[PDB]
């Protein structure tokens, strides 16, 4: 009785404390910088041969290799410069919703509705990409996975749980709880000491790998959260949601900086990413178009059209030379 | 122009392209079926009839037609987020048990399973991702239903049913109420078959329902329909 009422008072106290800190609107401060202007990006490469609904891609750190996840049961690793296919990984379970590429380039992760995360070794002496390690113990569908290191990986699952996995050991070291809704995506900061995961309870919670407990929590969205990506500095993270809005949250400020939205678009945001500088915010909508927005100006800098179906995922490479978008029409297109 | 290793890399990519097109043709012939229903409906029984954590995938071949049955009952997650994965499906196999009306829900709240099953069927049928997908309805435990309806009337659970106590009348009334839950009758057929202890009958009905879907798809492809 008293304890439940206290929670409402504590939340109200946090609300008042947040508003106490805020003095100047970010849009008023960003007015000084001039607008970037029209940004036109032309298609450079068209990748074919998936023949099924693509859900996930991930860039390598060499800025040339990228993995792609399709519903036919194939992980295809691409040579982006020469259009050649480097690897074709047959999958046991066709239903796959995420794929990760290691920073060293040794390993490839995948996961989906089978509740199993499969780690594939690429530098084996036999020459065939075989199953190295299968992670198990998730009660919900895996939605996202990212390699912190060649031995450690954080996966997000549909049982409202996240976990830090030791690849060599095969068991989970740190388990995260406290998500009311189902988690949908996660992103890694460059220092890799912390990550933020957005769930279906309209909240995005920062997670500290070393501490193992929730550092911060933000609830600025209306309904759910489909996507979340860190800024290059590591202090901000743009979020994409199903309410046709995009919001930017600052860890140090601990409040909603800015809201990115326009009246005509009512469809959701599948994926978000950042460029090398971080000036351009790219987000793939369900209108068959990818909109390149500007973070500071909060205005549309460009429109990427050319996909025949919903854009499942979007990823900007490490050096920032190219942007490869994945859609449900089984075509991967590289935008420069 | 290209170096010696680069020309060999293109040759490796062409070999992969041959395998992906070969695997793509194999998957196109295969018929994908989505299995839905409650846990106590009898999903495990009817899969064992057709044969003889996460996704349970069933492979059986009847009359040179490949069937994939995907059982999603194990997952506890919210169904709304991952339901769009099954957009390209031929038919939905929805299984419920006729004897569920006397057995109240496991949760403390008083609710008749039959009405929970109506809510289960209504969300799938009126789902925006499933507009042209036919539903293959299976009614389980008819033999137990025949005994129970002799011992207990159907009036007690809801007063709306005022028909005489008969096995044929009670079964047909449950069948037509499930058909009335459909809101788009012209573009979505509902195939209702009473399950039984005879294995042979169940396998056949699925082949007849899938064949009409393949006819419907081909007619749409031609442009006649």
């Amino acid at each position, epitope marked *: 009785d008293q304890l439940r009422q206290e929670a409402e008072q504590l939340k109200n106290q946090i609300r008042d404390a947040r508003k106490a800190c805020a003095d100047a609107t970010l849009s008023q401060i960003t007015n000084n910088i001039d607008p970037v202007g029209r940004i036109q990006m032309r298609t450079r490469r068209t990748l074919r041969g998936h023949l099924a609904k693509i859900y996930a891609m991930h860039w390598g750190t060499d800025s*040339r*290799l990228l993995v792609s996840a399709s519903q036919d049961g194939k992980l295809i690793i691409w040579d982006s410069y*020469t259009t*050649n296919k480097v690897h074709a990984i047959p999958l046991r379970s066709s239903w796959v919703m995420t794929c990760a590429y290691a920073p060293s380039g040794n390993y490839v992760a995948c996961g989906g509705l089978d509740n199993i995360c499969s780690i594939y070794n690429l530098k084996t002496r036999e020459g065939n990409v075989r199953v190295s390690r299968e992670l198990a113990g998730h009660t919900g569908y895996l939605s996202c996975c990212r390699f912190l290191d060649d031995n450690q990986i954080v996966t997000s699952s549909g049982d409202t749980t996240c976990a830090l996995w030791d690849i060599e050991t095969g068991q989970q070291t740190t388990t995260f709880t406290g998500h009311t809704g189902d988690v949908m995506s996660l992103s890694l900061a460059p220092d890799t000491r912390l990550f933020v995961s957005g769930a279906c309870d309209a909240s995005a919670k920062l997670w500290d790998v070393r501490e193992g407990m929730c550092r911060q929590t933000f609830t600025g969205h209306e309904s759910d959260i489909n996507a979340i990506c860190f800024f290059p500095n590591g202090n901000a993270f743009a979020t994409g949601s199903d309410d046709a809005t995009c919001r930017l949250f600052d860890l140090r400020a601990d409040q909603e900086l800015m809201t990115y939205s326009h009246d005509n678009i009512i469809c959701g945001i599948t994926s978000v990413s950042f460029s090398k500088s971080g000036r351009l915010l790219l987000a793939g909508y369900d209108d068959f178009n990818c909109n390149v927005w500007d973070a500071l100006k909060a205005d549309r800098a460009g429109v990427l059209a050319g996909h025949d179906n919903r854009v499942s995922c979007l990823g900007v490479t490490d050096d920032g030379m190219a942007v490869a978008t994945g859609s449900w029409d089984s075509f991967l297109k590289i935008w420069n | 122009t290209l*170096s*010696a*290793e680069d020309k060999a*890399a293109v040759e*490796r990519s062409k070999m992969i392209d041959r395998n992906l097109r070969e695997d793509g043709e194999k998957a196109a012939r295969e018929v994908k079926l989505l299995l839905l229903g409650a846990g106590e409906s009898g999903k495990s029984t009817i899969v064992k009839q057709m044969k003889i954590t996460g996704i349970v995938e069933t492979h059986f071949t009847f009359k040179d037609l490949h069937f994939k049955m995907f059982d999603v009952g194990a997952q506890r997650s919210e169904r709304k987020k991952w339901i769009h994965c099954f957009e390209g499906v031929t038919a939905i196999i929805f299984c419920v048990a006729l004897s569920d009306y006397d057995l109240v829900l496991a949760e403390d709240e008083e609710m008749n399973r039959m009405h929970e099953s109506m809510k289960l069927f209504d969300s799938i049928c009126n789902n925006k991702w499933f507009t042209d997908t036919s539903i293959i309805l299976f009614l389980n435990k008819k033999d137990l239903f025949e005994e129970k309806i002799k011992k207990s009337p159907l009036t007690i659970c809801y007063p709306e049913y005022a028909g005489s106590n008969t096995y044929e009348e009670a079964a047909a009334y449950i069948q037509c109420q499930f058909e009335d839950l459909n809101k788009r009758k012209d573009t979505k057929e509902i195939y209702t078959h009473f399950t039984c202890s005879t294995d042979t009958k169940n396998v056949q009905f699925v082949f007849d329902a899938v064949t009409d879907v393949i006819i419907k798809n081909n007619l749409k492809d031609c442009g006649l329909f």
Partner: single-chain antibody
Amino acid sequence: VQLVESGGGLVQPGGSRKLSCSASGFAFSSFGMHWVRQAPEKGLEWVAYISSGSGTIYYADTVKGRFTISRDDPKNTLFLQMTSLRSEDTAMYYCVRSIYYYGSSPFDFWGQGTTLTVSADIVMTQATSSVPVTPGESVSISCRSSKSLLHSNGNTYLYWFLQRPGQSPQLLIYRMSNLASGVPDRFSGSGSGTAFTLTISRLEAEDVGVYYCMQHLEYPLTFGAGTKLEL
């Protein structure tokens, strides 16, 4: 991963002999196969190549026509067909597996070698022939080419091999910018077009052998003379 050759022995000149190499512990159908021959008192020499799936076949110009190469993937056996052998074919024949993609390390695994004794173009130039060295000092080995190996894609197709006495040769450095898997960090390659340099810091007794520089810019593959070190 293991490759063993069979079919050796003495062959009369003008006869015929069919070698068979059996593969174990790897996917034989995905690797291209190289035949390398070695004279008793001379360096290595390339013979032939077959691609995976038998899509393309290349030969050296001196061995064109007489030698026929085939492969059978369901039995995992590499077949070499030899017709009208001559007195210059008295060599030991090696089997080599080479996979080709971005980041791959071809020429990594070498066979054991079958002896065959018969009784009656980018020229790679080893400037030196033998250098006496002591264990501990840095050792410099130079190789030169007749054509600039710097291709327009940025890769320089020079591979460094070490053939330890009485053992099969192993790959040390591939493309000169990458160290092979299983090679210590004692070896380093440097240089530019037409002028290459190899350095061995913290020399070891096992390192002692014959060093080969190989071009892989265009067929036919031509090898180096072979710089031998001693103590």
